[PDB]
Design a protein around this ligand. Structure first.
Ligand code: POV
Ligand code: POV
Ligand code: POV
Ligand code: POV
Ligand code: POV
Ligand code: POV
Ligand code: POV
Ligand code: POV
Ligand code: POV
Ligand code: POV
Ligand code: POV
Ligand code: DU0
Ligand code: CLR
Lengths: 1105, 82, 91, 91
């Protein structure tokens, strides 16, 4: 059948035909007009049946020969006499309205369908999500139009409680009264709740127009909105999204689906609202402007397992208004004052004439209702009585079940309605159980309900008592919220690749991931020995800083809004912002380095760059408050973050805006100085004091209190306890500024010598210069080996791959390797003694020297890149060479487009030679630089310097070269000028930041270096190997300075959040929009105080009476 | 439309012919210069535009291999029948 | 245009109809050129198509690319991309 | 230093636990030098009843802005009862 429906659902066909009233209408001949008229006790006439039991029977009479014995006339019950058959009407209707083709899903089932079957159709076939609420609207039909305000409120509130609680508004479907007002309400607040509210009208197949059109198995069946000018029949309504078209008989009989609606009001009740929540899906009843049989239906609800409550809408109509007044004028839960029956029954009488026979019979259906006032609710329209029905409806299911507030809260948690929990569940007098808000917190954290995690903390939930090991294990092992599916791909990549099917994640496995995403020497709290013991054994199972364990959780589970919540809570804000930037940055890299449908890396890198900006904006906040303590905030050991450092975490994530921030750049400036005050010293005197040692003792050093914000070495800090003479030398030579200038002078003296050796005759044996030069490069290479070993992450391959990423460190290896090839050939070569350069081993050795020296001039740009002005130009040069590449490839093609025709036209008689690869490229290249070769153009001229090249076709070449230079000089060189002019500012801005960023790695490399430059360094190397087989900088605070610093951190985070709102709130965009919203509210009130005074001036001539 | 007019039941051939053959609103006076340039140049004085003549214009303005619903065989038959 | 389906398709057809109506207006003799009016009309629907593509692309990238290549079946078996290339609708 | 469990505020304090026989000089000393408090320009000693459920919405707004405004501008010490019921509860 290719439809789950047809195998399952059916219709009803009235197989059996029975008489009507038995009166043939008029018109004496009775036998055939019996065929013309006789509405079966079905309700359709004999011929409208078309049934196969009744198709070849009208020939004789029909079913049931003769009178059939009046008793047996009273025997048609559809059960025996109407057949279940395959559906014939399920599809998608379409409404003809402005730009909305509004769709639905009609089914056409028999009323006998099992209630399980219905819910299945709704959920799997129609692919609907189980609702968090069901608002079953019951009212009267053809209720013309409600007053303008009362339609606005019941039109905003029903939509607001259905868009926020994902609810199914069960209805009647007929475009008259209830469904008519529900639909208009939808249309007045559509397109914000469009694909969120699912409105199922349960209509009969009786009172239904274009009934024959809806027939058609699996169709896009059409439908109209032109109300049939004559008909009492009813049309389905525009905005209802689904339809249950029950069938038992025919037209009329609008009472066979009432039982099926009740089934769906039950079967949803037995489903759990959420996988974690034990409460069933709620069901509420909304009465507005009802009927005579409403108050009957109301009675049924409040007498069931459990009592489906009722929210009545007074001020709209008759039954609501009746039911409004009666339960309002009731005893607390019971009878009335001195008999109120006179007014009540009179009140009941005017709506509906009953008249003491059954106007009393209402008083019984009207007593048990008001006796159940606790379950009944009423929205007093026009009295701000719970702020449209959304509060009232949702409230109705919390107050009227005498339920625990645990269940009342959790319902709000599944609804995501914090206001209803904070204004009706956390109200004064509420008394909670020992750990019930904890179970709410556990559900809010898993369900990613940040706004309840806020509330549960604000009330009393301590995350120190809350957060334990076995619980925080659960939080990783959930699928009941927003998840990072990569956390398993990461936990796989650390646990050797094997994940058993269960594999309940362990915190030790999370610690291994945090070590891998944070890189280097990071050691998490979970991988330590002290945790692997308490863990496998299982206050001690409670973590000391819980909100640092959940910040990581929220990040590893890719829960930014929870991460951007738990970050404000707790201490070490700037640290956690730089960790998170690092976790997301590594999570992002491993997402791009993997195969997956959703890349989830532009999401993670943005998440990383969101916390990276929080750290910078807190640094700018601390720096604007105190500069000295802000620099201390960059270098204190964290002690919950692997003894790391907020700066070290930023350098780990290449978070350049933080390292290029003026605070770090000023600390970096102060670590460069050392104990020397270069504000009352000059570079002349540092150089002078390197060459004149006793001039070290005439320059200004820095006190211990001008060195407290500066991370130091231990030995350096041990000489802040006392300045004596030998201490004053240890302060000079160990400053990074001095190690620099003490290396530059050796390096400049090195080039002066190596320039001399390369320009002067090189004899058999190396001269004293060339020995001094080899010694430098030899020991300089030992230093680079030592730099690589004593670097960072113990994996030999990592230290390698880092050091070979800098430009000049690649050049250093070529420069060092090439020099000792050249020395091997130079020194290892048999001198000829007739004349040098007859030995080609010797020549090759020298020519490597003459080329190796180019590496060593270009390395001066690394020394010159220490200046604030020069260095950004040096980095800039390379960023431009990379960006001008494709312009220069075009310039190389125009070159060959010219050199090959020229060489071919001017030298026709050439055999193949390697000189043909020079001559196609040589002169055309030197033309780019202004050499025109004027007397080689027009080789047939008299002034020509190539008179023998004159021959056939050579008159073409001056035309060719005229085009060539026009292209190269007038187009391509000036296009490259234009390139540089329009890319200058942005490469200069990048190069300033990359310069400021790499000033960390540079300055911090000159703390670790020995004191002696690369010729005499070997002493320092040897001394460091002696004390290796015989025996970086840190910020030392006393315990009171750590206190004063954690205060300063806290105080500056407060000023950050305070000043962020004070700016947002004090902005014209915010002041226009709240002004906008107040003038709305006022205007409403001004046309209501304006109404009241219009009801006062009428009361000047009435009181006059 | 918002009230109840269905453009599916509304819009027919002889009606949608009228809508091209009106002068009682904002008009494109070039639609005749186009219907001329496709029908060989000859426009009799009456010349009530036909949808087949509009299909020829839509093919000419859309270019290439475009074949409108009006120039097909299945429409030239139902059309000349009605 | 807001009414019915195949919105992005109809926006690129209209851009093509007005663009050709505009070319044949400039290639003709007439007191009112009516081409800066038609090309603006063309460039108004051309922008509707781009702004719906940017809307589909920001929602799902894989299905938005499918929206460029499905046969239309009411537009001569053509393709929303092919209609844009037909009108030199570069954006 | 106690610590309160609230939204993003670990609110701190300085409990002392002294005998009621302490000389009144000693107290002011603790307040000023040890707790490092600045001598106030005013002392608003609030005296009221306990467990006073909740004031009307407007009257809570006014006694909530005014006490804060006369204490933030006059650097004042609002002496209280401490118990989270009534006076200290509303303060
Ligand atoms: C970041 C840090 C990275 C570090 C990177 C470091 C990388 C270092 C890389 C090093 C690569 C070194 C390549 C040298 C090439 C030698 C070839 C040569 O000259 O052959 C000639 C000499 O042949 C001899 O046997 C000469 C022996 C005496 C001289 C000693 C050589 C010193 C080598 C230097 C040691 C360097 C110390 C390195 C210290 C670091 C052969 O030619 P011939 O003699 O004219 O003819 C012979 C023919 N016949 C046999 C037929 C007669
Ligand atoms: C240390 C030595 C420095 C010397 C300079 C050496 C060049 C320095 C180059 C820096 C950056 C530019 C890219 C790297 C170049 C390598 C190849 C390459 O990328 O090819 C590209 C295709 O290009 C071709 O297919 C054409 C190559 C023709 C070679 C002609 C060489 C002669 C002229 C020129 C020789 C004279 C030198 C010109 C210098 C201005 C592919 O690149 P891509 O995939 O589009 O990637 C671009 C960047 N992206 C990854 C961010 C998208
Ligand atoms: C990122 C940067 C990378 C580079 C990228 C670009 C690639 C550059 C590649 C260029 C190709 C060069 C090939 C050389 C051909 C063989 C040379 C030879 O045999 O001997 C010659 C080598 O001695 C010299 O003096 C000439 C060396 C060439 C100088 C190049 C300058 C122009 C630069 C061009 C730049 C524009 C390139 C345009 C695009 C292609 C000597 O003379 P001969 O007559 O040839 O032979 C000896 C005979 N004789 C003794 C009688 C004289
Ligand atoms: C603004 C100023 C210009 C005025 C306007 C009027 C135009 C005036 C032109 C007029 C052309 C007629 C001159 C030919 C003279 C006689 C033959 C002769 O001596 O030939 C000589 C060369 O020259 C040639 O072989 C032919 C040159 C033709 C190209 C001239 C440019 C065309 C116009 C513009 C093209 C631009 C692109 C067009 C698109 C815009 C041969 O002498 P040789 O070379 O010294 O070699 C002899 C020795 N051998 C025997 C060993 C080889
Ligand atoms: C730039 C300032 C900053 C610091 C720089 C770093 C400082 C360190 C820098 C360099 C190392 C030390 C340099 C001097 C070493 C050689 C001394 C010498 O004379 O050797 C040579 C001596 O022997 P000879 O000359 O072969 O003897 C021949 C004698 N005979 C001919 C009589 C037999
Ligand atoms: C590894 C780290 C090194 C650091 C430096 C420490 C080591 C440096 C120390 C000592 C090394 C030098 C040893 C000299 C031995 C004698 C040489 C000789 O015979 O004569 C030469 C003398 O020497 C010179 O003229 C100097 C040669 C080097 C050039 C410049 C060195 C400056 C850099 C380093 C110092 C400043 C540093 C600056 C910093 C800003 C040349 O003689 P002449 O008179 O020209 O010959 C006549 C020519 N005629 C034949 C054509 C007529
Ligand atoms: C494949 C070859 C071996 C491997 C080399 C690989 C490179 C290894 C690295 C370095 C090499 C070690 C230093 C130079 C060695 C000199 C040797 C020499 O012959 O000197 C001669 C003069 O020249 C000198 O005495 C030069 C002295 C200055 C050296 C500069 C470092 C001093 C700084 C201190 C700080 C630390 C310095 C050290 C840091 C490493 C004296 O020798 P000779 O015999 O009297 O005369 C020459 C020969 N003849 C007899 C034919 C005339
Ligand atoms: C790990 C890094 C790579 C290292 C690579 C390995 C490097 C070492 C390479 C090679 C080892 C040295 C070979 C020895 C020479 C054998 C011939 C000989 O004895 O003498 C002949 C030399 O004839 C020549 O042509 C010499 C050319 C030598 C230079 C080539 C090496 C360039 C290295 C590239 C730069 C790399 C820099 C580093 C880049 C990073 C002739 O001289 P003779 O014999 O005395 O007398 C004449 C006799 N005859 C006329 C009859 C012929
Ligand atoms: C025996 C020997 C006697 C003495 C020898 C004397 C030797 C003299 C040695 C050097 C000359 C330069 C002296 C000026 C220094 C100024 C101060 C300074 O530090 O400025 C900067 C230079 O920082 C550097 O690192 C400069 C490195 C220079 C080497 C490059 C040479 C270029 C060669 C290519 C040219 C070819 C031509 C070369 C010639 C053929 C760094 O400062 P900053 O980072 O801005 O910090 C201050 C910031 N503030 C202002 C905010 C506070
Ligand atoms: C003989 C003596 C000559 C004179 C000595 C001169 C010494 C040199 C002087 C100054 C050197 C400048 C310092 C560089 C600073 C670091 C830059 C760096 O790390 O790499 C930069 C790129 O890579 C380069 O820029 C490569 C180095 C450029 C040298 C230019 C050679 C051109 C010649 C060849 C043509 C000759 C034609 C003829 C052929 C025969 C950084 O680029 P980026 O943008 O940050 O990132 C790249 C990735 N991207 C592509 C995606 C963007
Ligand atoms: C730009 C627009 C078009 C205008 C072009 C104007 C056309 C130009 C006009 C006329 C045509 C060219 C010939 C005129 C000169 C002939 C004189 C002569 O003999 O010259 C030489 C031969 O030269 C030849 O034999 C060349 C023959 C044709 C070359 C190909 C066409 C060039 C035009 C390309 C156009 C590019 C278009 C690019 C399009 C963007 C010299 O010969 P010789 O040495 O005296 O002979 C004796 C030799 N012996 C001693 C060895 C025996
Ligand atoms: C896409 C670009 C198109 C242009 C181009 O790049 C690619 O195409 C390349 C092909 C090269 C030639 C290949 C073969 C030879 C033969 C050789 O024969 C040895 C002779 C003898 C010594 O006397 C042996 O003993 C001499 C050199 C020569 C002619 C090359 C010249 C350069 C050329 C033209 C290159 C040119 C730059
Ligand atoms: C074709 C070969 C055999 C001939 C020589 C090629 C030329 C172009 C070579 C010889 C030595 C080379 C230089 C050696 C060292 C450096 C320093 C480095 O930081 C940038 C490149 C630079 C500046 C090289 C540029 C190219 C260079 C000048």
């Amino acid at each position: 059948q290719k439809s789950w429906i047809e195998s399952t659902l059916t219709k009803r066909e009235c197989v059996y035909i029975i008489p009507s009233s038995k009166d043939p209408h008029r018109c004496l001949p009775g036998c055939q007009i019996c065929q013309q008229l006789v509405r079966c006790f079905c309700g359709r006439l004999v011929k409208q049946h078309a049934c196969f039991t009744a198709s070849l029977a009208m020939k004789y009479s029909d079913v049931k020969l003769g009178e059939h014995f009046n008793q047996a006339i009273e025997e048609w019950s559809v059960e025996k006499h109407t057949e279940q058959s395959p559906t014939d009407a399920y599809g998608v209707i379409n409404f003809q309205g402005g730009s909305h083709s509004y769709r639905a899903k009609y089914v056409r089932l028999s009323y006998d369908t099992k209630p399980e079957i219905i819910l299945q159709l709704l959920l799997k076939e129609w692919q609907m999500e189980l609702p968090k609420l069901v608002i079953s609207v019951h009212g009267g039909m053809q209720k013309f139009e409600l007053h303008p305000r009362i339609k606005q409120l019941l039109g905003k509130g029903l939509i607001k409680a259905a868009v926020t609680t994902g609810a199914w508004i069960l209805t009647g479907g007929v475009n008259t009264g209830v469904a008519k007002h529900v639909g208009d309400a939808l249309k007045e607040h559509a397109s914000r709740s469009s694909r969120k509210i699912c409105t199922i009208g349960i209509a009969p197949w009786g009172v239904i127009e274009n009934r024959n059109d809806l027939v058609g198995r699996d169709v896009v069946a059409p439908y109209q909105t032109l109300l049939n000018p004559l008909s009492k029949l009813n049309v389905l309504n525009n905005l209802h999204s689904h339809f249950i078209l029950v069938d038992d008989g025919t037209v009329g009989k609008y009472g066979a689906e009432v039982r099926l609606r009740r089934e769906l009001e039950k079967t949803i009740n037995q489903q759990r609202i959420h996988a974690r929540i034990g409460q069933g899906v709620p069901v509420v009843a909304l009465i507005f402007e009802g009927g005579p049989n409403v108050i009957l239906t109301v009675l049924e609800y409040l007498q069931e397992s459990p009592p489906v409550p009722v929210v009545v809408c007074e001020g709209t109509g008759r039954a609501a208004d009746l039911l409004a007044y009666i339960h309002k004028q009731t005893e607390e839960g019971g009878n009335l004052p001195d008999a109120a029956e006179p007014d009540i029954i009179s009140t009941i009488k005017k709506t509906f004439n009953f008249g003491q026979s059954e106007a009393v019979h209402l008083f019984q259906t009207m007593m048990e209702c008001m006796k159940k006032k606790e379950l009944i609710t009423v929205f007093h329209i026009g009295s701000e009585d719970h702020q449209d029905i959304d509060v009232a409806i949702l409230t109705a299911l919390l107050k009227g079940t005498n339920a625990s507030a645990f269940d009342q809260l959790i319902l709000t948690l599944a609804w995501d309605r914090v206001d209803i929990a904070k204004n009706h569940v956390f109200v004064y007098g509420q008394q909670w159980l020992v750990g019930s808000l904890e179970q709410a917190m556990l559900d809010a954290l898993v369900m990613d309900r940040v706004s309840f995690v806020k509330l549960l903390i604000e009330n009393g939930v301590s995350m120190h008592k809350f957060l334990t090991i076995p619980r925080l294990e659960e939080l990783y092992n959930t699928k009941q919220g927003p998840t990072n599916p990569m956390l398993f791909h990461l936990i796989r990549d650390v646990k050797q690749g094997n994940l058993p099917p269960g594999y309940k994640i362990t915190l030790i496995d999370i610690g291994l991931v945090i070590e891998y995403l944070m890189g280097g020497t990071y050691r998490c709290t979970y991988t330590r020995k002290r945790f692997r013991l308490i863990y496998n054994s299982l206050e001690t199972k409670r973590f000391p800083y819980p909100l640092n364990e959940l910040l990581i959780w929220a990040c590893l589970m890719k829960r930014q809004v929870m991460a951007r919540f738990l970050w404000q809570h707790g201490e070490e804000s700037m640290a956690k912002a730089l960790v998170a930037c690092k976790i997301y940055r590594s999570m992002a890299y491993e997402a791009k380095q993997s195969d997956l449908v959703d890349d989830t890396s532009e999401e993670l890198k943005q998440y990383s760059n969101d916390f990276g900006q929080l750290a910078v904006e807190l640094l700018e906040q601390s720096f604007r408050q105190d500069e000295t303590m802000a620099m201390k905030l960059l270098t204190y050991e964290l002690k919950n973050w692997s003894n790391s450092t907020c700066l070290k975490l930023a350098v780990s994530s290449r978070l350049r805006p933080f390292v290029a921030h003026t605070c770090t750049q000023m600390l970096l400036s102060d670590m460069w100085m050392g104990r020397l005050n270069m504000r009352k010293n000059s570079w002349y005197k540092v150089i002078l004091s390197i060459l004149v040692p006793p001039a070290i003792l005439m320059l200004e050093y820095k006190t211990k209190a001008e060195m407290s914000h500066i991370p130091q070495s231990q030995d350096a800090h041990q000489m802040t306890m006392e300045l004596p003479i030998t201490r004053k030398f240890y302060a000079f030579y160990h400053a990074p500024i001095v190690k620099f200038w003490f290396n530059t002078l050796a390096y400049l003296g090195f080039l002066m010598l190596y320039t001399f050796v390369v320009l002067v005759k090189m004899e058999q044996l190396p001269s004293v210069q060339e020995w001094i030069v080899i010694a430098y490069i030899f020991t300089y290479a030992i230093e680079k080996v030592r730099e690589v070993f004593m670097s960072e992450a113990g994996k030999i391959s990592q230290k390698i791959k880092v050091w070979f990423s800098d430009y000049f460190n690649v050049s250093d290896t070529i420069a060092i390797i090439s020099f000792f090839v050249g020395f091997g050939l130079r020194f290892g070569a048999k001198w000829n003694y007739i004349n040098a350069y007859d030995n080609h081993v010797f020549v090759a050795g020298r020519l490597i020297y003459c080329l190796n020296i180019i590496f060593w001039y270009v390395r001066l740009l690394d020394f010159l890149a220490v200046n604030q002005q020069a260095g950004p130009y040096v980095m800039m040069i390379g960023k431009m060479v990379a960006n001008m590449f494709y312009i220069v490839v075009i310039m190389a093609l125009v070159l060959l487009s010219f050199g090959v025709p020229r060489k071919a036209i001017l030298y026709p008689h050439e055999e193949p030679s390697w000189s043909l690869a020079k001559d196609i490229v040589f002169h055309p290249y030197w033309m780019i630089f202004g050499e025109v070769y004027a007397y080689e153009i027009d080789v047939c001229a008299n002034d020509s310097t190539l008179p023998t090249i004159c021959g056939p076709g050579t008159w073409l070449t001056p035309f060719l070269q005229a085009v060539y230079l026009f292209v190269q000089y007038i187009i391509m060189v000036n296009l490259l000028i234009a390139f540089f002019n329009n890319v200058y500012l942005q490469v200069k801005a990048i190069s300033n930041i990359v310069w400021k960023y790499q000033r960390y790695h540079f300055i911090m490399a000159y703390h670790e270096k020995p004191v002696l430059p690369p010729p005499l360094i070997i002493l320092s190397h040897i001394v460091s190997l002696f004390c290796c087989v015989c025996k970086g900088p840190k910020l030392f605070l006393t315990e009171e300075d750590q206190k004063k610093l954690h205060d300063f951190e806290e105080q500056c985070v407060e000023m950050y959040f305070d000043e962020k709102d004070d700016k947002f709130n004090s902005g014209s965009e915010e002041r226009i929009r709240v002004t906008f919203e107040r003038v709305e509210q006022m205007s409403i009130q001004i046309k209501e105080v304006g109404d009241r005074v219009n009801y006062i001036k009428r009361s000047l001539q009435s009181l006059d009476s």
